[PDB]
Amino acid sequence: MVHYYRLSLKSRQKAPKIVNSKYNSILNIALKNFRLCKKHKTKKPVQILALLQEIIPKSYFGTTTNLKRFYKVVEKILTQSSFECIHLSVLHKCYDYDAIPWLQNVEPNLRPKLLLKHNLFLLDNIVKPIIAFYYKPIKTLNGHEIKFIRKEEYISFESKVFHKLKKMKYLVEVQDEVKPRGVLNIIPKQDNFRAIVSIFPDSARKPFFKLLTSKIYKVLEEKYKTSGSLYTCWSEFTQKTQGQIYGIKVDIRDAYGNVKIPVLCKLIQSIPTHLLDSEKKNFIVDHISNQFVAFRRKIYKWNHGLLQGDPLSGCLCELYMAFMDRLYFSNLDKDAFIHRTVDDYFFCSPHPHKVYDFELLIKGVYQVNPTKTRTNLPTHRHPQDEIPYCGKIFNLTTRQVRTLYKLPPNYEIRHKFKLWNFNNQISDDNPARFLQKAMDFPFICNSFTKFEFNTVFNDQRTVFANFYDAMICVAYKFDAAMMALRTSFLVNDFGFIWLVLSSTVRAYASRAFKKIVTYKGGKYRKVTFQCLKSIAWRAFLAVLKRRTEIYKGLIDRIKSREKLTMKFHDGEVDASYFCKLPEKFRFVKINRKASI
Ligand SMILES: COC(=O)c1ccc2c(ccn2[C@@H]2C[C@H](O)[C@@H](COP(=O)(O)OP(=O)(O)OP(=O)(O)O)O2)c1
Ligand SMILES: [Mg+2]
Ligand SMILES: [Mg+2]
């Protein structure tokens, strides 16, 4: 009931020093070569595919077709996203079987599965290990993007921040050979770093930690400030505020690190016992004072605030921050806009001086991160009016809210979408259910909200732009699915994709219509299912025309048999934007070619 094979490097097994009776010994040439190359040292010019071509002799494949069928999957490994798989299928499907020299002497009909086992050995014992020898993979945290960084430079970088953490006092060796919470990982930021904990998977206390986060979130709700709700706050502020809106958003530097455990333990102790009893109070306090992690092999106590990656860190940081809000941010204009999430504050006032004062107050309380500040304050050199907060983009002048999309230059969009899941596999001969489960609406629901579809503060223009921008993300993940199909499912008839595509267009259009009807306001004019449907169709054509040397069939099918005419009951909404790719999507990389 396992159909997939995952591209992750942990799938690797320890390279045996010579293969045994079961396996053909043709590959021990390559097992020898893995050692002959690992006893090599280089410092700059390295191609991964090229050198693998020399560890594994061409004689294992015998021809030029089987070898490229193998190097497709090694390429996919090189360009992997986290939790991305291939079908075990691809390691035996449509091979030339009597062109290899070494199953020419085995049962003609038993070749598939033991060639599969052989290829499995190749990749698990040589391919992913040679990579893991030359590179570390790191998660960008931008989707499932994995960047490959040569371990030589990364060990150095890890060493420099370990330097900073022991040259400071943030990390003190305890050597109690004490059970550590988990393994410390250093992960690059931009020009910076981030120190994280990977918890040891010991699922005896996971429901306990969940009970605890639950309890103190209930404590947050009843004890601390009901923080309104972002949509409500923005709605009512923009309605009551006639004039030009001034605003600022600031990010607190090292939020988890600058929590003061003294103050935190006090706050924990102050909680009424009917909400958090004495034992769990003491466990939590002991827990946040006593945080041990393993790094290299020496054990270290973490002294710098709450430590990221720990299950209680989010809830305790919000407890601390709500306390700080009560202490320092209680006296601001009740007719002004204020909202916080975690380390991000968003303040707005028609009064410039009041926005200026809020910034001064914040910079007095916390150490802000200047890089991340966004404001139309005249005091700042480069005023913005679009400020990003909570994955939205609030326009201070127009009061419009657009979905914010994190898509850096030359970011491969396929890294946002988790096409495969190991726990629920799908066999190679059912592409329809795979496409379906990829087109399930959760992955885009977060840009289908009142924030996007209200006609209370947002124009009809803006609502429709939000819908089209969501359907672009949707069509992109549809194209990602199709790539997975053509290179793992290796599809025969594409008859199901027309039905899947029609179904998704119509269902997402229906959800959009219902959301828009639900949040009607003073700037509603009229919205139509025909218009929504054709917006979505245009969104799909916009994506598919970047490979219209593939999708010419589908392109022309939808243009021939579908309604795309764009008529609004408004003269305000520019339709030229609903025909091109939006400026945020037209440069995301769609080709999956082995970089380093
Ligand atoms: C590596 O995978 C993970 O498991 C993972 C990623 C991010 C995580 C956790 C746990 C908490 N978070 C982040 C904590 C951070 O504190 C906060 C705000 O993020 P941010 O402002 O961007 O970083 P921070 O303020 O500390 O420092 P900075 O401002 O750059 O100085 O959400 C686990
Ligand atoms: Mg921050
Ligand atoms: Mg932030």
Author numbering: 1 to 596
How is this structure described in the published paper?
Telomerase is a multicomponent, ribonucleoprotein enzyme that includes a catalytic telomerase reverse transcriptase (TERT) protein and a noncoding RNA molecule that serves as the template for synthesis of telomere DNA. Telomerase functions as a unique RT that uses a specialized, noncoding RNA as a template for telomere DNA synthesis. In highly proliferative tissues (e.g., during embryogenesis, germline and stem cells), telomerase, the enzyme that synthesizes telomere ends, is reactivated to extend telomere DNA to counterbalance telomere attrition. Although TERT contains additional domains, its catalytic core is structurally homologous to the RT domain of HIV-1.
In doing so, we have identified 5-methylcarboxyl-indolyl-2′-deoxyriboside 5′-triphosphate (5-MeCITP) as an inhibitor of telomerase activity. To identify the precise interactions that govern 5-MeCITP binding to telomerase, we crystalized the T. castaneum TERT-MeCITP complex along with a nucleotide hairpin that functionally mimics the telomerase RNA template-telomere DNA substrate. The structure of the complex refined to 2.8 Å identifies density corresponding to an unpolymerized 5-MeCITP residing in the active site of the enzyme. The triphosphate group of 5-MeCITP is coordinated by two metal ions in a manner that is structurally similar to that of a nonhydrolyzable nucleotide analog bound to the active site of other polymerases. The modified nucleobase of 5-MeCITP adopts a noncanonical configuration in which it is rotated 180° as compared with the expected orientation of a native dNTP forming Watson-Crick base pairs with the RNA template. This configuration is very likely governed by an inability to properly base pair with RNA combined with selective interactions formed between the methylcarboxyl moiety of 5-MeCITP and TERT. Specifically, the methylcarboxyl moiety occupies a hydrophobic patch formed between motifs 1, 2 of the fingers domain and T-motif in the TRBD. The positioning of the methylcarboxyl group of 5-MeCITP is coordinated by interactions with Ile187 and Ile196 of motifs 1 and 2 and with Leu141 of the T-motif of T. castaneum TERT. The unique positioning of the modified nucleotide coincides with a displacement of the nucleobase of the template away from its canonical position. The α-phosphate of 5-MeCITP is situated at a distance that is approximately 5 Å from the nucleophilic 3′-hydroxyl group of the terminal dATP of the ssDNA that is being extended and is therefore too far for nucleophilic attack and incorporation into the 3′ end of the DNA.
